[PDB]
Enzyme design. Structure first.
Site, PDB file in Angstrom:
ATOM      1  N   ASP C  54       0.831  -1.195   0.000  1.00 25.64           N
ATOM      2  CA  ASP C  54       0.000   0.000   0.000  1.00 25.64           C
ATOM      3  C   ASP C  54       0.869   1.249   0.000  1.00 25.64           C
ATOM      4  OD1 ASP C  54      -2.917   0.456   0.013  1.00 25.64           O
ATOM      5  OD2 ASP C  54      -2.499   1.674   1.790  1.00 25.64           O
ATOM      6  N   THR C  87      -4.282   4.840  -3.604  1.00 22.33           N
ATOM      7  CA  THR C  87      -3.388   5.737  -2.884  1.00 22.33           C
ATOM      8  C   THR C  87      -2.044   5.913  -3.579  1.00 22.33           C
ATOM      9  OG1 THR C  87      -2.268   4.110  -1.491  1.00 22.33           O
ATOM     10  CG2 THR C  87      -4.479   4.793  -0.846  1.00 22.33           C
ATOM     11  N   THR C  88      -1.668   4.997  -4.469  1.00 28.64           N
ATOM     12  CA  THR C  88      -0.430   5.128  -5.229  1.00 28.64           C
ATOM     13  C   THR C  88      -0.639   5.896  -6.527  1.00 28.64           C
ATOM     14  OG1 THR C  88       0.287   3.002  -4.319  1.00 28.64           O
ATOM     15  CG2 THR C  88       1.493   3.862  -6.213  1.00 28.64           C
ATOM     16  N   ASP C 391      -8.363  -3.014   1.850  1.00 23.78           N
ATOM     17  CA  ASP C 391      -8.501  -2.342   0.560  1.00 23.78           C
ATOM     18  C   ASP C 391      -9.656  -2.933  -0.240  1.00 23.78           C
ATOM     19  OD1 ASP C 391      -6.443  -0.620   1.104  1.00 23.78           O
ATOM     20  OD2 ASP C 391      -5.259  -1.139  -0.667  1.00 23.78           O
TER      21      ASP C 391
HETATM   22  N1  ADP Z   1      -6.004  -7.795 -13.793  1.00 30.48           N
HETATM   23  C1  ADP Z   1      -5.644  -6.550 -14.190  1.00 30.48           C
HETATM   24  N2  ADP Z   1      -5.360  -6.283 -15.482  1.00 30.48           N
HETATM   25  C2  ADP Z   1      -5.003  -5.051 -15.887  1.00 30.48           C
HETATM   26  N3  ADP Z   1      -4.896  -3.997 -15.061  1.00 30.48           N
HETATM   27  C3  ADP Z   1      -5.154  -4.124 -13.740  1.00 30.48           C
HETATM   28  C4  ADP Z   1      -5.551  -5.437 -13.219  1.00 30.48           C
HETATM   29  N4  ADP Z   1      -5.739  -5.284 -11.897  1.00 30.48           N
HETATM   30  C5  ADP Z   1      -5.486  -3.985 -11.597  1.00 30.48           C
HETATM   31  N5  ADP Z   1      -5.134  -3.297 -12.695  1.00 30.48           N
HETATM   32  C6  ADP Z   1      -4.792  -1.856 -12.752  1.00 30.48           C
HETATM   33  O1  ADP Z   1      -3.605  -1.596 -12.010  1.00 30.48           O
HETATM   34  C7  ADP Z   1      -3.695  -0.294 -11.438  1.00 30.48           C
HETATM   35  C8  ADP Z   1      -2.942  -0.245 -10.117  1.00 30.48           C
HETATM   36  O2  ADP Z   1      -3.774  -0.645  -9.034  1.00 30.48           O
HETATM   37  P1  ADP Z   1      -3.099  -0.804  -7.586  1.00 30.48           P
HETATM   38  O3  ADP Z   1      -1.739  -0.163  -7.670  1.00 30.48           O
HETATM   39  O4  ADP Z   1      -3.192  -2.239  -7.135  1.00 30.48           O
HETATM   40  O5  ADP Z   1      -4.027   0.115  -6.648  1.00 30.48           O
HETATM   41  P2  ADP Z   1      -3.360   1.215  -5.682  1.00 30.48           P
HETATM   42  O6  ADP Z   1      -3.038   2.351  -6.620  1.00 30.48           O
HETATM   43  O7  ADP Z   1      -4.436   1.515  -4.673  1.00 30.48           O
HETATM   44  O8  ADP Z   1      -2.154   0.523  -5.097  1.00 30.48           O
HETATM   45  C9  ADP Z   1      -5.172   0.021 -11.286  1.00 30.48           C
HETATM   46  O9  ADP Z   1      -5.441   1.332 -11.788  1.00 30.48           O
HETATM   47  C10 ADP Z   1      -5.891  -1.010 -12.131  1.00 30.48           C
HETATM   48  O10 ADP Z   1      -6.645  -0.359 -13.154  1.00 30.48           O
HETATM   49 MG    MG Z   2      -5.538  -0.816  -5.507  1.00 29.88          MG
END
Ligand code: ADP
Ligand code: MG
Lengths: 212, 52, 532
Positions: C54, C87-88, C391
């Site tokens: 996170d 949040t990232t 989350d």
């Molecule tokens: N299975 C997937 N295939 C393609 N893109 C994905 C998949 N799962 C998540 N994502 C993308 O990856 C991005 C990063 O999400 P993540 O970094 O996990 O959330 P956070 O920013 O809260 O840490 C998200 O914007 C999402 O659209």
């Molecule tokens: Mg996320």
């Protein structure tokens, strides 16, 4: 040579920057040094009784905890000592140990502090080098083992030369009893071990309701 | 320090002894609710007051 | 001349410094974005270890000095608090916005014009998202919730086991559903007690159809299992009644000291007898219980639990129908305890969880509650599972509250970039540059996703932009708005049919917060650092 009355007037107000530059460093210097004046100089210048329960006290003091036993915190610099000592509250009791390597008595009471911190979570046991503390070299000869206790900015423990009062092989029971009979160690409480943890946080108060 | 502001806003008159706590010293209000600020904290509002 | 005891930075120097700080904060967590992102791990000075993914947690753990870096860290904290996800991405977007805005400013473009362009671009991006890129979840069903949970849990320690963790999350969220006035369903997340315990694998994590207490019975005498539980919730201690500070006992006739001492505990005895005479089986109190009261409960074959957490007791009382009691005083001025305030549950047990015991209140009546017990390899892994689970719960709550979702994998970012690049030409003379830079900075998300997978970022982003441009220019091929990024194979993919969703509120709030943070930092053009 006349004109003794000078009234330097504009001079000092035109040189405030550099004088204050010296003054801030000097302020740090004597704040740090006076934080250890109150210990230095004046200390160095100056059949139930058979402890049957001592053995079993050691026996259930052996079971420290589940997740390892950690270690005793070490202070890197005098500025670090000051900025870790001015923080927290009055309720936190701090014991600090000055030491050097190789000299007798340090390892035994260091292990004693380790296990005490294991079974006294509230206290903030920590150790600092004599070179780091920058004390007088008279301490560096004849005042190394010093079970120093602090409580929120003021001295509550006045113990130096603990080797004479305890020995060299003294264990956790000896130092623990010696500290508690001076009214320093807080009363212990029955603490159990949960699974690992429960409290992630408590910030939001949206919990429950059953409105129609 | 907020007593004067609260009394001016609502109309309540402070009561310092239970003997004088009467209905005429109460400030009427249409709604007094505690709202959630989208998880950023709880805020209490008294919106709508007779004789504002 | 100034004669100020401090250091002063003015002009391009301070702007470059702020951009450097923001870029450093972004690059700290830029490697932990998307399913191919890899977790970090932090060691404190004492030696504590925290493995996490996170962004908000990482930025909270770090100690930061530069004010702009602190601004971005607090921005991540705010995004975590008000949304729970993204949040990232918000931090990365804010830093890229600041970098591009400063690049514009370095070209003698006035910061006010850049700020106005950013404001208009953010407003139009929000409008376009709300008008074109939202998908209603009414026709998708439970599969929408499952896919949203799976997408949220991707890139986390529980990513591969999403097929089961999403089911658990959705069941937990639906368990704590309640409706309030105005007829709006509400999902009070953080009421799901998350319990961690090392031991068996991840798949052995249990969802409790009830509530779980990290507490045990006060004495070994009481039974550890009651079938028809009658829970009594108390907010006071059960000890020997010591008189208050204002009351002092003075004895002049010695014959009454024994009576005084006897009554001193007979009061508590009578209180416990009143509590027990109504048929109560389980007694939970926030205060302490001493040995005498514990024995009193033991003899009656009931359960007594002491030092129960206040929030846990409130949740248990609300679920089981019991009422919290500070005192056993009624409106008639005496001591009473009616049966109408007793809670009920179908079973109360003390299960053993990896050489440790906890109390399970199973199948509470009059309200359905939930709790989750996470089993992991060690403490750090359990903590990471708890963070990822929180989350996912927040994401499911957002999806269930607002029924609009958007495709993931950078599809929204590419569509917004194309639309804003087209739209900038129709507004102003120098604001168009700011809007175009906003559109370009919006492309940092798909670029980072592609980079983290060791794929050709340039070609992938070019293909995504071409697809979205063709979708926006051809009115008969509007279905291409859902083209996202398939990181497993490094090819564009229709994410809407691939089940890659996320709440619209995540994107909207992240965009607004990042824009406002970039505006706040951009206003600074001089720094005065007074010497301490
Ligand atoms: N299975 C997937 N295939 C393609 N893109 C994905 C998949 N799962 C998540 N994502 C993308 O990856 C991005 C990063 O999400 P993540 O970094 O996990 O959330 P956070 O920013 O809260 O840490 C998200 O914007 C999402 O659209
Ligand atoms: Mg996320």
């Amino acid at each position: 040579l006349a004109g003794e009355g000078i009234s330097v007037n504009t001079g000092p107000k035109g040189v405030i920057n550099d004088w204050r530059r010296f003054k801030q460093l000097e302020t740090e210097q004597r704040e740090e040094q006076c934080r250890e004046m109150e210990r230095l100089i004046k200390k160095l210048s100056m059949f139930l009784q058979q402890y049957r329960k001592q053995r079993m006290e050691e026996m259930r003091q052996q079971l420290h905890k589940g997740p390892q036993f950690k270690q005793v915190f070490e202070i890197s610099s005098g500025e670090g000592f000051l900025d870790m000592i001015d923080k927290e509250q009055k309720s936190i009791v701090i014991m600090v140990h000055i030491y050097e390597d190789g000299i007798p008595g340090t390892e035994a009471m260091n292990g004693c502090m380790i296990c005490l911190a294991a079974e006294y979570p509230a206290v903030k046991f920590c150790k600092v080098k004599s070179s780091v503390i920058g004390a007088s070299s008279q301490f560096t000869r004849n005042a190394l083992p010093a079970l120093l206790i602090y409580k929120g900015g003021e001295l509550i423990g006045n113990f130096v030369r603990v080797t004479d009062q305890l020995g060299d092989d003294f264990f956790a029971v000896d130092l623990e009893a010696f500290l508690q009979e001076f009214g320093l160690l807080p009363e212990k409480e029955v603490l159990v071990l949960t699974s690992v943890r429960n409290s992630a946080t408590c910030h939001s108060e949206d919990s429950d309701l059953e409105i129609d | 320090e907020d007593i004067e502001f609260i009394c001016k806003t609502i109309g309540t008159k402070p009561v310092a002894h239970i003997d004088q706590f009467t209905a005429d010293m109460l400030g009427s209000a249409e709604l007094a609710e505690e709202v959630n600020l989208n998880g950023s904290g709880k805020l209490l509002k008294i919106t709508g007051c007779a004789s504002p | 001349p100034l004669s100020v005891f401090g250091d002063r930075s003015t002009g391009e120097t301070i702007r470059s410094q702020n951009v450097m700080a923001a870029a450093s904060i972004a690059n700290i967590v830029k490697s932990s974005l998307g399913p191919v992102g890899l977790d970090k791990m932090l060691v404190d000075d004492i030696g504590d270890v925290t493995i996490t993914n996170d962004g908000a947690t990482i930025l909270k753990l770090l100690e930061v000095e530069h004010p702009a870096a602190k601004v971005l860290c607090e921005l991540a904290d705010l995004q975590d608090k008000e949304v729970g996800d993204g949040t990232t991405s918000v931090v990365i977007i804010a830093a890229e916005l600041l970098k591009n805005a400063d690049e514009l400013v370095k070209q003698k473009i006035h910061p006010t014009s850049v700020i106005s362009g950013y404001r208009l671009a953010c407003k139009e991006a929000v409008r376009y998202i709300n008008e074109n890129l939202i998908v209603n979840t009414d026709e998708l069903g439970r599969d929408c919730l499952i896919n949203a949970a799976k997408t949220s849990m991707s890139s986390k320690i529980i990513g591969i086991n999403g097929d089961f963790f999403a089911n658990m999350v959705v069941d937990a969220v639906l368990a704590i559903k309640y409706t309030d006035i105005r007829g709006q369903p509400r999902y009070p997340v953080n009421s799901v007690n998350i319990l961690k315990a090392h031991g068996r694998s991840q798949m052995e994590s249990m969802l409790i159809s009830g509530y779980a207490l990290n507490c045990v019975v006060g004495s070994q005498g009481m039974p550890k299992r009651i079938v028809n539980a009658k829970i009594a919730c108390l907010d006071f201690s059960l000890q020997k009644t010591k008189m208050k500070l204002g009351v002092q006992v003075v004895i002049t006739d010695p014959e009454k000291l024994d009576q005084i001492r006897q009554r001193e505990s007979d009061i508590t005895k009578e209180r416990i007898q009143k509590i027990l005479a109504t048929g109560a089986n389980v007694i939970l109190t926030t205060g302490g219980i001493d040995d005498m009261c514990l024995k009193y409960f033991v003899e009656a074959g009931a359960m007594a639990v002491r030092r129960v957490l206040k929030r846990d007791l409130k949740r248990i009382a609300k679920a089981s129908g019991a009422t919290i009691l500070s005192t056993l005083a009624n409106l008639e001025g005496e001591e009473t305890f009616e049966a109408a305030m007793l809670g009920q549950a179908e079973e109360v047990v003390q299960e053993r969880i990896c050489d440790d015991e906890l109390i399970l209140i199973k199948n509470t009546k009059a309200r359905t509650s939930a709790s989750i017990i996470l089993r992991g390899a060690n403490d750090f892994m359990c903590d990471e599972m708890e963070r990822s689970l929180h989350d996912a719960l927040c994401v499911v709550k957002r999806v269930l509250e607002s029924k609009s979702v958007v495709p993931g994998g950078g599809a929204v970012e590419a569509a917004l970039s194309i639309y804003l690049e087209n739209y900038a030409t129709s507004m102003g003379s120098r604001e168009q540059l700011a809007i175009a830079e906003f559109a370009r900075s919006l492309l940092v998300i798909p670029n980072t996703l592609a980079v983290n997978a060791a794929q050709d970022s340039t070609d992938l982003v070019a293909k995504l932009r071409a697809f979205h441009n063709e979708a926006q220019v051809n009115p008969e091929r509007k279905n291409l708005k859902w083209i996202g990024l398939d990181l497993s194979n490094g090819k564009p993919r229709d994410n809407k049919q691939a089940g890659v969703f996320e709440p619209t509120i995540v994107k909207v709030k992240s965009l607004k917060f990042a824009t406002e943070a970039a505006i706040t930092i951009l206003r600074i053009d001089d720094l005065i650092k007074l010497h301490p």
